[PDB]
């Protein structure tokens, strides 16, 4: 048998990331397969969230939310126009028809 | 020397992911360190994008964008109120002061 010849066939400990992000260990201590499985999920997730995020961020900033106030204002305007009509039509009724103004007990 | 023995000390090929997502190979063919490095980025990215996505999605849907239409309508209303004032004030000028209406050439 080889003179001792310890079976130290450890794979390349190329893990040189002397960094300790809370999940770094767990990330290295996980099996590459799993990390990959979560990549297909997390990656596709971020990918899908990129499509949305792109739009979302562009839309949101370009979004507000006031159409109901608008509507109330349009309804209000149609309401004021109601009075405008009532008042102008009367003003006109005094103005348009000369020498005609409703013969009220003016004199 | 050992009777051939062969150095077949290959690590456990526990890569049972018999799946071929376009990046699966490349994902396994990358070094775990790198996959981890991109996790710290992609993960924190998705983390940040989760915070925003959450709000964004909640906000966007609950957002619109009409305040300027609103404003135009408020300006419009103030405008109509301008007339309402002009017309009501005149209607009143005919109504309020009895036996007083501007002695126009009515008679």
Summarize, please:
With 107 residues, chain A is mainly alpha-helical. Chain A has helices at residues 24-29, 32-61, 67-95.
By secondary-structure content and strand pairing, the structural class of chain A works out as: mainly alpha
DSSP summary: helix tally of chain A: 3
Helix-strand pattern of chain A: HHH
Number of domains of chain A: 1
Distance between the termini of chain A: 138 Å
The total strand number of chain A stands at 0
Q: Which percent bin holds the helix content of chain A?
A: 55-70%
Q: What characterizes the major β-sheet of chain A?
A: none
Oligomeric state of the chains present here:
homodimer
Give the largest interface: A-B, 61 and 61 residues
Which outline of chain A best applies? rod-shaped
PDB class: transcription
Keywords: transcription regulation, transcription elongation, symmetric dimer, MAQ1, CLP-1, EDG1, transcription
Assembly: dimeric
Entry title: The Structure of the Cyclin T-binding domain of Hexim1 reveals the molecular basis for regulation of transcription elongation
Structural topology:
Two copies of one chain form a homodimer.
Chain A lengths: L23 H6 L2 H30 L5 H29 L12
Polypeptide structure, described:
Two copies of one chain form a homodimer. The first copy, chain A, is mainly α. Chain A has one domain (1-107). Chain A contains three helices and no strands. Chain A has helices at 24-29, 32-61, 67-95. Chain A is rod-shaped. The first copy, chain A, starts with 23 loop residues before the first helix and ends in a 12-residue tail after the last helix. The interface between A and B is large, with 61 and 61 residues.
């Amino acid at each position: 048998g080889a003179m001792a010849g310890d079976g130290s066939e450890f794979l390349q400990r190329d893990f040189s990331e002397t960094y300790e992000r809370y999940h770094t260990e767990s990330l290295q201590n996980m099996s590459k397969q799993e990390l990959i499985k979560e990549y297909l999920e997390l990656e596709k997730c971020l990918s899908r969230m990129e499509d949305e995020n792109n739009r979302l961020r562009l839309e949101s900033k370009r979004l507000g939310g006031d159409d109901a106030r608008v509507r109330e204002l349009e309804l209000e305007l149609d309401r004021l126009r109601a009075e405008n009509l009532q008042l102008l039509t009367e003003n006109e009724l005094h103005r348009q028809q000369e020498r005609a103004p409703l013969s009220k007990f003016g004199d």
